[PDB]
Design an enzyme around this catalytic site. Structure first.
Site, PDB file in Angstrom:
ATOM      1  N   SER A  42     -23.223  13.133  -8.930  1.00  0.00           N
ATOM      2  CA  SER A  42     -22.845  13.444  -7.534  1.00  0.00           C
ATOM      3  C   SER A  42     -23.537  12.532  -6.544  1.00  0.00           C
ATOM      4  O   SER A  42     -22.882  12.108  -5.608  1.00  0.00           O
ATOM      5  CB  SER A  42     -23.181  14.852  -7.231  1.00  0.00           C
ATOM      6  OG  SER A  42     -24.583  15.048  -7.303  1.00  0.00           O
TER       7      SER A  42
ATOM      8  N   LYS B 282     -22.315  22.961  -1.432  1.00  0.00           N
ATOM      9  CA  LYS B 282     -23.001  21.881  -0.742  1.00  0.00           C
ATOM     10  C   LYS B 282     -22.798  21.966   0.761  1.00  0.00           C
ATOM     11  O   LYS B 282     -23.752  21.798   1.527  1.00  0.00           O
ATOM     12  CB  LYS B 282     -22.521  20.537  -1.259  1.00  0.00           C
ATOM     13  CG  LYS B 282     -22.986  20.209  -2.642  1.00  0.00           C
ATOM     14  CD  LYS B 282     -22.454  18.858  -3.037  1.00  0.00           C
ATOM     15  CE  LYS B 282     -22.817  18.513  -4.449  1.00  0.00           C
ATOM     16  NZ  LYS B 282     -22.291  17.179  -4.779  1.00  0.00           N
TER      17      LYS B 282
END
Lengths: 193, 146
Positions: free
Chosen positions: B91, B134
């Protein structure tokens, strides 16, 4: 599929048990000391396939317009997206050769031709396994020009003819046929050295 | 969220099975002869993401004001605090590119902007997973530009 010619980037076919797929190899020829970082979570078989293809190109530098001393000056970096996808096998032997040659030679590699095949050390394209599923996944993305080993000629008689009426199959035996079938004959970028 | 623009630091978003969690990426560019130390208990994929981002920046030095030779003049060092959190997954790759380019350019990165995203070698930003947690954790820490 992508659409356009890219520089040092080769389109290739893969194989799974859930149906084959595409995967692109993109490499970089950045200046440095000369070593070979092989990222993108590759097994050792694909690493040795990379070293075999690179060894074949080191043995022919005046053919394909390569710079000569790219073994102690050019710090090659082979990356196979994406990460966290365990990918290995000798099948992407021709793809890595085309990618490395396009990167080192500054001539683009036309991305609208899918390919496969295992390279020897003499430059002897060997057969592979599972041609059908690679071809079907190539046809789904809208690619209509294929490269394949000459030894893979009996494998083609299991596709549907409606598939076979579109895909124009090339059947090569050596490397220079593929290296003149996938390169534009024009340098674009300034070189590494 | 740290307020001031820091040099060599990029605010990032990661997630655990607890929920989202901020990460910062401290990066030092200290003299040497060309190395790459990746500390902070990183996984393998995350190291390869850092190598990919550095290879992209080595290919494109004139675009960003990076130095003219830093494959053999600078020993980079990339620390990801804290030191007891094992961290993996691809990521964070564009935050590593942001941190490395700010450290190698001396232009302070903005710390009021969270970011996430996997990086290619041509330079494409490839899509990632876990956007929901997130962005929730980016909001709860008071960050409003993603």
């Amino acid at each position: 599929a992508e659409t356009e010619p890219q520089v040092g980037t080769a389109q290739g076919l893969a194989w799974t048990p859930v149906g084959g797929t595409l995967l692109t190899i993109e490499v970089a020829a950045v200046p440095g000391s000369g070593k070979l970082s092989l990222t993108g979570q590759l097994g050792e078989v694909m690493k040795e396939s990379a070293q075999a293809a690179l060894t074949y190109l080191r043995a022919h530098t005046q053919d394909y317009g390569l710079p000569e001393d790219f073994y102690n000056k050019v710090d090659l970096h082979v990356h196979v997206p994406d990460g966290a996808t365990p990918k290995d096998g000798p099948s992407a032997g021709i793809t890595m050769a085309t990618a490395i040659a396009s990167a080192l030679s500054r001539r683009p590699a036309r991305m609208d031709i899918a390919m496969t095949g295992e390279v020897s050390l003499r430059g002897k394209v060997m057969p592979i396994g599972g041609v059908k599923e690679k071809l079907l996944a190539a046809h789904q993305a809208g690619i209509h020009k294929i490269v394949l080993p000459k030894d893979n000629e009996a494998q083609l008689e299991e596709l549907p003819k409606e598939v076979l009426e579109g895909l124009e199959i090339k059947l090569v035996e050596d490397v220079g046929e593929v290296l003149e079938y996938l390169l534009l004959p024009e340098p674009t970028m300034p070189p590494v050295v």
